[PDB]
Symmetry: D2
Subunit: 238 residues, 4 copies
């Protein structure tokens, strides 16, 4: 069967033939590339941006905010019970693609916290990780497809040359090595927060295709046919 | 000039004359004792209970859950922008009352985290405290009214005897000593999370009146007339 | 080549033939079962104990303390630079054995934090995990030898029957799934802290053999001949 | 009665007068301006530096490292039992002075964590704060002497002009608002960690006088005569 995917997308390229709004946008994706909720994103190609993502099983609202130094922020939210969508054990990761058009999909930092609180207090679990730059040989990441860490310590999700020039038709993903426990039958509340900073540079008039933070089944792998507009996440546009 | 109050109430006594539902309930109170959202609380007098509260400014949803070991939990949420309600600097606290009827309002643990973020993975401001014991001299709490720490290390918000028998017509509150910064001009996202565990015992067959977590202006005090049904928060029932 | 091991041992059985003092002891082991430092441990068989372990690269002192409710604590320290000992990437874990004599090697909770700092604030890493009780399918743990999680949610490092009776000649370990990055060429300061709570029960007049927290090369596995007095860590007593 | 002081000094100006070494140095001060331990400071006037300080009560080792974007590292350590020196409740803070000679004493960030542990994985008391910008009205800091926050959001501990030139004969301190519980009768282990980033700039051939992180009785205030060489911390040079 296909993987089960929940994602927040920073979608730089409007694919209106598969339901994208006709502008760069942020979106919340629940098992489909066709986002349940979107907000218009005013990209600053060449500038370092920041994304903050949060979810709590009591509120049942997955939210995301994108900002840049000295600019107005873009926000997006969706009401959803993640226990009905995802398995109890997941992996978390970042993905990016290029297609006919291209961009650098550079990650400068990534942090993530999750918590599982139950009935009994001494029945609980937490996981936190934080990367400010990345090791050249990162043993706590599963790197998939074209993803790699360059000589500056930056995570490049898609291909770039030695001079830093991006390449088209590229796909890559980075997953945290340990599975994450996001629900159980006795749980009272589960929550997570994620942050990443990113640098999209591009020589193209319309940069493409984007970067996601995603949560999937533990054995998730890049699907066949998921390049370009499908963001390395989905086998089709349904 | 009255305080500005946001609270989560565990209201054990139905004051139907001032808009309570006719059962013990959990509520979200925005500037009034008359809750904007309530849910049925299945009290278990004599068992240790746990409350988890959370908010973030992108989701704009204040939510709370109450539970006991081996039991079903109760949730309540309300969509609100706290920027629009509270001043930028606050104190946070726990309050409790008894009236004609009575209960012990015993706090066994209390923790709190607030974050103010912008454009990096590290937060521009964060505060975290956690008490699992309470000290015989809590120099980091402002104790108001009948609130005191006992010989067992527990925090008693209202009057109780040597023998563990609660008293009627009591009011008590405990505030964390340092002001918390909950928004600013430059802010991208602000969030907070709080947890407390409580023991409510009663000789009566109808215990009263309840316990809250609340957030207020920094100079907040127990208002004249806030006994019983007003939970030590409000000077009247409007 | 053999594994590289740094460990804190709760050594319940004196094997004076390989240099144990003639009493139960807590020990710091650096690449040998023969401890670099020991202290007398006053065991309370059948009671839940707590161990706290810490280290940072400026102080260069690895310390551990073992305690029980109502008792006084025993401490042990050793001055060592852990980088000259350990590789840059490690796994962290828990190990236990039994031999001719036996005990339960039960883990009720385990937490770990590591941090690696430079000065970019944006060149760095942290990892934190916390388990209060353990899942029936612990996908974030690598279980080795006889280790398993039971119906109560406890981690059993060595064999116990369904009635909870321990078995002799057992060895088991549990490793956190993700590698930990503990040094790099640009590092200024690296630190770690670990906590575990444990329950050692035994029908034997002299219980054996003990429990350790350990740090090893990422590919560590139970050496042949590490049963009993070698605590699942070393292939010989050198 | 005088304040009770424990400090880590970054001392830019040798006062051989009162027992400084005859070079710029970092030091550990236990109840006297006359450091119990010093190290020659690998100083870089005009560069952003970072200080990390740590202590735990099992190891009994107070340690500090000062570095500059990864280079030019200096360390200092002292074996000491702080339960014998400090009261159980304290305030923590930063101080700085100029005298005949001068430098900017600029704080760009500051964080602190304190923990008091016993018999579990969850701590019985913890406190954590973090500032990466400082507020125009920082209600959670007690600002003493010349200390103010500037339009950039930096904390200036001593007088600086509107353009950016430091003034002589100035003193300033910033204390965190809430008292900190550092030890108790039945504590198993107490620990704290602090980090700050600073910028010392000077038009002088020989900058003065330095910056400290310190720990004091909760009621601490700038003593009379503690200018220049006494770092705003001590009334005399005894
Ligand atoms: O990278 C931008 C887009 O490039 C391709 O789609 C096209 C967008 N504009 C075009 C113009 C001509 C042709 Br042929 C193609 Cl395939 C496209 C495809 O690779 C899409 O998946 C992708 O989103
Ligand atoms: O503790 C329960 C309640 O007791 C008091 O109200 C009454 C409850 N039963 C009554 C019966 C008669 C009269 Br008069 C009163 Cl005020 C009450 C008041 O103290 C209320 O504020 C409180 O909610
Ligand atoms: O569990 C206690 C000990 O049992 C064995 O060693 C012995 C301890 N007392 C003995 C008495 C007789 C014989 Br045979 C043996 Cl092997 C032992 C061995 O399994 C040791 O590794 C272990 O430490
Ligand atoms: O700012 C650096 C120093 O300047 C002063 O000490 C002197 C250093 N050189 C001098 C030369 C003359 C005189 Br008068 C004085 Cl007080 C000093 C005093 O203000 C000292 O406390 C301070 O350490
Ligand atoms: Ca698209
Ligand atoms: Ca009521
Ligand atoms: Ca032994
Ligand atoms: Ca000096
Ligand atoms: Mn899209
Ligand atoms: Mn009510
Ligand atoms: Mn031993
Ligand atoms: Mn000095």
């Amino acid at each position: 069967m296909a993987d089960t995917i929940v994602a927040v997308e920073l979608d730089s390229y409007p694919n209106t033939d598969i339901g994208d709004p006709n502008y760069p946008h942020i979106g919340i994706d629940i098992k489909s590339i066709r986002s349940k909720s979107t907000a218009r994103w005013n990209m600053q190609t060449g500038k370092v941006g920041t994304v903050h993502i949060s979810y709590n099983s009591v509120a049942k609202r997955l939210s995301a905010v994108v900002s840049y130094s000295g600019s107005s922020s873009t926000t997006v939210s969706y009401d959803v019970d993640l226990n009905n969508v995802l398995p109890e054990w997941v992996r978390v990761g970042l993905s990016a693609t290029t297609g006919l058009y291209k961009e650098t999909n550079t990650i400068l930092s990534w942090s993530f916290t999750s918590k599982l609180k139950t009935n009994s207090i001494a029945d609980e679990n937490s996981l936190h990780f934080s990367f400010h730059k990345f090791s050249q040989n990162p043993k706590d990441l599963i790197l998939q497809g074209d993803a790699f860490t360059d000589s500056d310590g930056n995570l490049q999700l898609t291909k770039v040359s030695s001079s830093g020039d991006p390449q088209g038709n590229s796909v890559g993903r980075a997953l945290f090595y340990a599975p994450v426990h996001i629900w159980e039958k006795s749980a009272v509340v589960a929550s997570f927060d994620a942050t990443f900073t990113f640098l999209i540079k591009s020589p193209d008039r319309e940069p493409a295709d984007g970067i996601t933070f995603f949560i999937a089944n533990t054995d998730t792998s890049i699907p066949s046919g998921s390049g370009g507009r499908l963001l390395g996440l989905f086998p089709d546009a349904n």
